[PDB]
Amino acid sequence: SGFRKMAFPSGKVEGCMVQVTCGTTTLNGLWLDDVVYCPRHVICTSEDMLNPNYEDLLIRKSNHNFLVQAGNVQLRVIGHSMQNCVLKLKVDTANPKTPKYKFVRIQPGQTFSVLACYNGSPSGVYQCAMRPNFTIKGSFLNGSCGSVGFNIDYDCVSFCYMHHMELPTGVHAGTDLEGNFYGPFVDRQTAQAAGTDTTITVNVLAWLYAAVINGDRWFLNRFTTTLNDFNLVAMKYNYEPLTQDHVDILGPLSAQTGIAVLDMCASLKELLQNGMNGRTILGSALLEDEFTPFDVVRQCSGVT
Amino acid sequence: SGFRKMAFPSGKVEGCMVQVTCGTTTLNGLWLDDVVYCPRHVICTSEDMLNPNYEDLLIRKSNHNFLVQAGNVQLRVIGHSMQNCVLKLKVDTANPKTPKYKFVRIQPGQTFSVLACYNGSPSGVYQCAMRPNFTIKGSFLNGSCGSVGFNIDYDCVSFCYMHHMELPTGVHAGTDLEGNFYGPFVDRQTAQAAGTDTTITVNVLAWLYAAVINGDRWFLNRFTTTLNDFNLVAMKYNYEPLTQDHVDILGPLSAQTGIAVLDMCASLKELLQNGMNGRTILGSALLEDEFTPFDVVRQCSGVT
């Protein structure tokens, strides 16, 4: 019993973190096989960040200008290339701690663990969601760039995020491991406003199922609804529309609890309309949306 | 910017987790040097848990009855002893991944990371606090016993908790690594009710400092208070009394923000009396008390 914002164990990723320095910029790199992946803005001064031409800045850089340190041992850089917004530094040594891995590009609403790093050294691990506006609400200071987001399926690390940018609003933007930004963001210090941070409806419903499983049941009401009726209310409250695909994904939690998805929708509808009235659900005074249906099943079933 | 419930990177602890089986009971062990530490209730059937005599049950157990598996390799048990509520299984092999470590007994209000494990395999990491009633609000299923709580100071893991028990209220109880329960709890399936779960006042104040640092300032008011006046209000709201020792501990955050501790107390007093009025602080609708002043400084300064 109990339900926590739980991150993946970070060890497999800790084994991959390195320091990358180019001139006076130091950030983090991900070392997988004989390639170190890092944000291309490693090559920028803060002056350059205002209007960088990455291809032109990169011409002035040689392999030996990229200083890669793993622990307190230097890696030899034998090649470098730019792929979208990441650099790939080819080193002469395969990371002996390379886990089984994949690069995945996640969808908004999907959750992942972040290993916050500074100078190639892990400081902390926390759980995030790709927001519907393609920001993430992280905890990142100067030097945190190249920190990565990931999921683990048994022994396979799926890397889904690399940290590049903080927006003036103090929310975060970054890339998949192919260097493609999530959403419309760019690695330039310019006006970049985020769109509406809508609530991830399917995740709230999952978390209400988590609450029922863990004994928090006060919000279960006598009502049901339809997807169309629920969605009129979702729209009004800046919740994402619920699809039949979301209903299908919640099936296992519906089955485990015996509460029909549309009945839980009607409970959520009343919570939106009435509020919590000073009550809590799983120790929260607001409706939590950074647990996926898969997260709730995993945590409630104890997958390793 | 941003402020997250952040756990220590778990890798150093993942390297220590093993499976312990005695008869039909399987739980987790901590392997440090040539000793495996596990809950003594590994020797109990669920029938035994109703009224166990551990010394008498232990007489019927030999070294070879304790099956210790690290990955998919068996460790040879060459000795066993009971220390308070833990067993110490001496094995013939020092854990080659033993980090620098200490055993510490933490005080209520202190926070730590939990590596939730099943069958010696890590499932997740999350942040906890030793509650003022000496419970913790964890996420633990059958098989999670022997999962450990820890802090890390650079490269030294301080182990402070081992998971033993879920109370009928679905809150958690366990020991330090000397096998001494936190609070009055026992490793027996009996009536054990928790006392008042008071709010860790110094931790709330730390988290309000975190909020100011991270741009959330709407709750800063024009008032101050005294420790005695604040404490009259704390008492009424089931907050722990604030001491001058707590004020001293908040000094660095006071200094960084220029907000006197007693001014932040007066802001907290108004929040208690007025509520949040549907507003949030660092994405929470309630006052968070599982960040210590040290946690806020660490996360806000990026210690590795």
UniProtKB/Swiss-Prot annotation, chains A, B:
Name the UniProt record assigns to this protein: 3C-like proteinase nsp5
Q: Which residues carry out catalysis?
A: H41 (for 3cl-pro activity), C145 (nucleophile)
Query: What does changing Q189A do?
Result: Does not affect ability to cleave and inactivate human TRMT1
Its job? Cleaves the C-terminus of replicase polyprotein at 11 sites. Recognizes substrates containing the core sequence [ILMVF]-Q-|-[SGACN]. Cleaves and inactivates human TRMT1, preventing tRNA guanine(26)-dimethylation of tRNAs. May cleave human NLRP1 in lung epithelial cells, thereby activating the NLRP1 inflammasome pathway. May cleave human GSDMD, triggering alternative GSDME-mediated epithelial cell death upon activation of the NLRP1 inflammasome, which may enhance the release interleukins 1B, 6, 16 and 18. Also able to bind an ADP-ribose-1''-phosphate (ADRP).
How is this protein's activity controlled?
A: Inhibited by pyridone-containing alpha-ketoamides compounds 13a and 13b. In turn, alpha-ketoamide 13b (tert-butyl (1-((S)-1-(((S)-4-(benzylamino)-3,4-dioxo-1-((S)-2-oxopyrrolidin-3-yl)butan-2-yl)amino)-3-cyclopropyl-1-oxopropan-2-yl)-2-oxo-1,2-dihydropyridin-3-yl)carbamate) inhibits SARS-CoV-2 replication in human lung cells. Inhibited ex vivo by michael acceptor inhibitor N3. Inhibited ex vivo by compound 11a and 11b.
Q: Which residue numbers mark the cross-link Glycyl lysine isopeptide (Lys-Gly) (interchain with G-Cter in ubiquitin) in this sequence?
A: K5, K90
**Gene name, Swiss-Prot/TrEMBL:** rep
Residues in domain Peptidase C30?
1-304
Signal peptide (UniProt feature, chain positions):
none
What is the protein's quaternary organization?
3CL-PRO exists as monomer and homodimer. Only the homodimer shows catalytic activity. Interacts with host FBXO22; this interaction promotes the proteasomal degradation of nsp5.
Which organism is this protein's natural source? Answer: Severe acute respiratory syndrome coronavirus 2 (2019-nCoV)
Q: Which reaction does it catalyse?
A: TSAVLQ-|-SGFRK-NH2 and SGVTFQ-|-GKFKK the two peptides corresponding to the two self-cleavage sites of the SARS 3C-like proteinase are the two most reactive peptide substrates. The enzyme exhibits a strong preference for substrates containing Gln at P1 position and Leu at P2 position
- Shown residues within the full chain: 3264 to 3567 of 7096
What subcellular compartments does it reside in?
Host cytoplasm; Host Golgi apparatus; Host nucleus
> For side Cytoplasmic, which residue ranges?
1-304
